[PDB]
Design a protein around this nucleic acid. Sequence first.
DNA 1: GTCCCTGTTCGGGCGCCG
DNA 2: GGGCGGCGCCCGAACAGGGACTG
Lengths: 545, 388
Amino acid sequence: PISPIETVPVKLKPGMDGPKVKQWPLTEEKIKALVEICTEMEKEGKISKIGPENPYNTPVFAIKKKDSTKWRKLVDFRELNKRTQDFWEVQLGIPHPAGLKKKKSVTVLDVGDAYFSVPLDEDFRKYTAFTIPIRYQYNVLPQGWKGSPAIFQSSMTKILEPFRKQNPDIVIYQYMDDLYVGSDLEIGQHRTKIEELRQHLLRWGLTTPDKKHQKEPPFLWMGYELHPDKWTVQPIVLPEKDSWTVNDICKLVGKLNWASQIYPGIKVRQLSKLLRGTKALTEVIPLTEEAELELAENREILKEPVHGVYYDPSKDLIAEIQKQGQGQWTYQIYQEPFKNLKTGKYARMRGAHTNDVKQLTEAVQKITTESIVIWGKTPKFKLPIQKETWETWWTEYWQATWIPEWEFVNTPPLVKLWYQLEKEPIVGAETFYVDGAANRETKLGKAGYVTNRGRQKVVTLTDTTNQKTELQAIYLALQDSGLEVNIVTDSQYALGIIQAQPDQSESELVNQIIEQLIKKEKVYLAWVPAHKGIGGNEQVDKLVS
Amino acid sequence: TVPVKLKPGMDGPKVKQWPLTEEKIKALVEICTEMEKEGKISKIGPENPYNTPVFAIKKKTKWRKLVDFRELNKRTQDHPAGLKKKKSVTVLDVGDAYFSVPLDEDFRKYTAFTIPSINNETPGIRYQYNVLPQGWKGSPAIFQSSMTKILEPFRKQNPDIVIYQYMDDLYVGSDLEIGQHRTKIEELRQHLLRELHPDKWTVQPIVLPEKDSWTVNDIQKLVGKLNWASQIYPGIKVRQLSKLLRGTKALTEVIPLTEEAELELAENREILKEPVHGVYYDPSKDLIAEIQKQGQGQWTYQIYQEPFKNLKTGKYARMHTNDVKQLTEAVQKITTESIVIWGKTPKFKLPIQKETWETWWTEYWQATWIPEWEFVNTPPLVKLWYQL
DNA sequence: GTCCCTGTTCGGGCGCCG
DNA sequence: GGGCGGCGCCCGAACAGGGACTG
Ligand SMILES: Nc1nc(=O)n([C@@H]2CS[C@H](COP(=O)(O)OP(=O)(O)OP(=O)(O)O)O2)cc1F
Ligand SMILES: [Mg+2]
Ligand SMILES: [Mg+2]
């Protein structure tokens, strides 16, 4: 039937009217499906016949539902969606099975014709006009309108509110019309409560047909198979083509990202790099050797069987993190040693220049937020980084950075800083004064150094910038110096970059500089204000100009 | 009620709610159940397009709901000098008094907020306010007359006590002994049924190193620091100290200071004691607060409105530490000082990654207000400039 | 000011759910 | 074959803020 719930008042955007789009041709099979659906809905009062007093229209069509032979009726409401007021969505995220707790009894049920049971604002019905190749208008929520998900979710919450009040210890995970219902009752009392809930929904016009009433495990829910003590992800079929287009790569990367929630070790960076600057989806992208190897490793790890467990709130949450190359990290969240709640990846490249301690801190932040969402608390961390390494980093780093309660794990590759700048100048190390200049008109530049031991060198550069010439001068000093070197620089840009101790950069010049720095034994980098006559920065400035 | 409007050409807040822990969500559910049963708030739906984040804080097992009205306050239509000189100043939460005045009906849609659920078991539950909400700019303004009528007798019987109101707090300053100050505060708490020490706050000046032996590196660092400082104090001179660095010398070479350089350094030490000239507080501009982490639990901060025209400079010196917690505490201290001095909160340039701060800052907040802030990839040079 | 560099946000494609 | 909303991922475009530079 139709819910006797009150309607949600909606309005068009100011100064706009309803859509007047013309119906496009449809297949006779789609036409028959639509006429059957529409006769049924018109009998029940969910759609109403209209006349010439309705000047609006919007095209309709139908798709095959997930069920065998059922058709879903859709309306291309893109125009009305443009004209319609904004809403605040109430779906704040997706529930995850690792956040479920052990329940004695579980039921999964689904509301039949969910949208078509919630009434629509009368004043708005005018704008939902369509024509089946007979014209109708919607008295209920249509599928294709942008305001339907939020209105249905809010109405569902209002409907479930009295039952949740009366039954606070029955847990109802309410995704749009799918309801997971868990209780600590024996199976008979649980079924009695389920009948109470079904009668409550039916009182509010929401049927729960038996064909979608799951009463025994494994429960199919949100793309998972829920067992009493374990949960698995419904199987992921990754494409196995020989030619790869951009759309195929996007599909494969999406499937791998979806898989990484329970399969450890998934990597997508080399496959994602194939999508730089590509014009359209049909563009064929030949796989890189690195992308080939990454795909092979993912395919191999996807062959093993894996499952998750449910959350016990009387025990600790533990997130353990592992590092791979290319700025990629995996993590497992568990409570018992080899019983994962879930897994995940982290591969974001934050900034032009970074190191592994920064990326570990960022992964910790991401995992912390995800855990706050799923379980409402922060986990204890196991990290492949010495306490002394982190002590050094956060002692010498100018930014506020903090990792929550954590302990060291002995699994390589350990996170380490690859070089250390000195706090004091080095006795016995030659002193390089470096500088670079660039002409903003011709883009020609020079970089170079003088030394307290009489050496000077100047390199000419084309198609360069001031910052680039400063970095080149530092690089030249690193090239032409011994294992220990004092460098006085002009540029707080280059100084700020190097002081952060990057091991990875998108700049090739900064990568060469990093290589040199790792090769050295002691490096001291000092700064002086430019153009102040401070020797021997004065000499370098005169030279590179 | 009084009609309240937004600023011309401005819409309401549309800020998404951030994840909350289980204890905060439970505290908010209980508080909102009580507020709804008392008529203070009402459930709303998605046809209201506005939203403002909400969370909770636990002070001293009693939780307090805190709504982040920064955007709404910023979009809403538009001071005792002796308070900063009082011996003791107590902060009193008087926000509950706002729940007795109804809110303009057409304005209520802008105060919407959403309570989330653990693991997204349930869509966000949305409410709007029916009364003057705590943390909104309009609440003290609209309640001002009632507050003055309440506080008139206590001010009359105590003319030497300074009571100032910021958004949800009364700052009560007295010069008498502790123990009697608490007695007067208790008397005022009795009257409201109808611990700071500002005279000890100190300024952290810029100081130059004192050595018996100076290397080329020491003098280069000193010259850089003085060249920066001369942007604030034009009396700083660097010529004679820079003279000692002519040529291409080794950083560890020892340079003896001439009489000229010694006199110049002494003059510069003296100049850094005088206060900055021509620094006038602009009520129409924002207070900018910069913070630098100096390490070992040390933090420096400057409050200014124009570059190099510092209104104040100071430090926060804590002693297995937590950088984020110390930074939030320093932010709250600086904001309290700014409220006491100028009656306004500053906009903070925070030396921290955005995600770190937004992940952990609500775990250490204890104030009823929230200042504006932004995040900075700070330069180590300015960090060296304010070192101690 | 302009030019360069870096960081944020938002919108596009895909994936998952209904 | 398409329409809708949420979340996720990654990438490019637009925009903001700050530093160095010319003459
Ligand atoms: N692809 C989809 N687009 C949608 O707009 N919906 C919306 C949001 S959830 C709602 C569910 O509707 P119905 O109950 O009519 O359809 P259903 O296949 O989920 O279930 P049923 O056939 O009525 O038992 O339809 C679902 C989709 F799968
Ligand atoms: Mg259904
Ligand atoms: Mg230079």
